[PDB]
């Protein structure tokens, strides 16, 4: 407890609180916009999924993790990564893709020799169908004839909650050629090729649109807390500072008096 | 009926129906 150190700490916490309150407001803005654009996206994405649940798809006999590049959003990344390692283990060949640098840095080292591609520039600007199409294209143009894949992301629920979820990618044009698909006739073996490609971009887009909503609401929340903790810390250090300031003077003065009286 | 793109080419599906809309030759065709 040195008036010097105390002051050193106050100095760095007052800035933290400032930068942290700023980051909160920016996020809450990004979140607000994201929450809205998410309304349509769900209906659209849930629509894309309307075919497969409405009618079975399994697989006889690619893990995609989505998040972002920026941290300071609680456990957005660690969650998907956690579930990502879980799959790769329980499993059949293993190959992976990470959208958002954070995934490529987290569920990484242990599994680099288990990578296909990775994506950057995710999260700063709102995601687009266009970005999803790049991800899809990049995959189709890959030598990985994946038979089945899963997409792991954070499904928004509220500003104070989200849930890491998984979505099956039976994109296997081959798998979409099972018994259950006998109900739908007048389907060229290659009309599906177009159908699957498309529904692949839709699912990547959906996860992407859910992800930024979860991310911006969690960064907002995390930065609200951080800022409030900072201020509290500020209030305490200040009060600790004054107690110390008063005791040093008193202490230094009693010392002078003692010496003087002894004479 | 569900029809959407951003807003609520592409695909169409009849099971409930859902319509989902998002080199020179292709461009010509579109224009």
């Amino acid at each position: 407890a040195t008036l010097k150190d105390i002051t050193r700490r106050l100095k760095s916490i007052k800035n933290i609180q400032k930068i942290t309150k700023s980051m909160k407001m920016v996020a809450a803005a990004k979140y607000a916009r994201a929450e809205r654009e998410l309304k349509p996206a769900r209906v659209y994405g849930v629509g894309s999924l309307a075919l497969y649940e409405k009618a079975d798809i399994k697989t006889p006999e690619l893990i995609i993790g989505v998040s972002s590049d920026r941290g300071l959003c609680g456990a957005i990344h660690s969650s998907v990564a956690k579930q990502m390692k879980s799959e790769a283990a329980n499993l059949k060949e293993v190959k992976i893709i990470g959208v958002g640098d954070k995934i490529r840095s987290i569920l990484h080292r242990t599994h680099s020799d288990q990578f296909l591609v990775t994506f950057k520039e995710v999260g700063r600007r709102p995601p687009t169908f266009g970005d999803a199409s790049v991800i899809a294209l990049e995959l189709l143009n890959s030598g990985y004839e994946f038979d089945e894949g899963s997409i792991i992301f954070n499904r928004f629920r509220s500003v104070i909650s989200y849930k890491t979820e998984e979505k099956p990618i039976f994109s296997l044009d081959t798998i979409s050629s099972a018994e259950s698909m006998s109900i739908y006739d007048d389907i060229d073996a290659d009309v599906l090729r177009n159908y699957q490609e498309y529904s692949l971009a839709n699912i990547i887009y959906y996860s992407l649109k859910e992800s930024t909503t979860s991310e911006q609401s969690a960064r907002m929340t995390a930065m609200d807390n951080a800022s409030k903790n900072a201020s509290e810390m500020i209030d305490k250090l200040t009060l600790t500072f004054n107690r110390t300031r008063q005791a040093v003077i008193t202490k230094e003065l009693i010392e002078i008096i003692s010496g003087a009286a002894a004479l | 009926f569900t029809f959407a793109s951003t807003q609520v080419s592409g695909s169409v599906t009849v099971n409930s129906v859902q319509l989902l809309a998002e080199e020179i030759q292709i461009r010509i065709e579109a224009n």
Binding site: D101, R104, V117, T118, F119, K120, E121, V122, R124, R125, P126, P127, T128, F129, G130, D131, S133, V134, I135, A136, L137, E138, L140, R193, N194, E197, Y198, L200, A201 | S5, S9, G10, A21, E22, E23, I26, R27, A30, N31
Partner: peptide, 28 residues
């Protein structure tokens, strides 16, 4: 197709005729 193009790419062109690009590749 046969020309190397895929369908997403077709949809891309068609949709534009009638849309970000932030994403960046990290291939290693």
């Amino acid at each position: 197709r046969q020309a190397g193009l895929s369908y997403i790419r077709y949809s891309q062109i068609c949709a534009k005729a009638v849309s970000g690009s932030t994403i960046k590749i990290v291939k290693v």
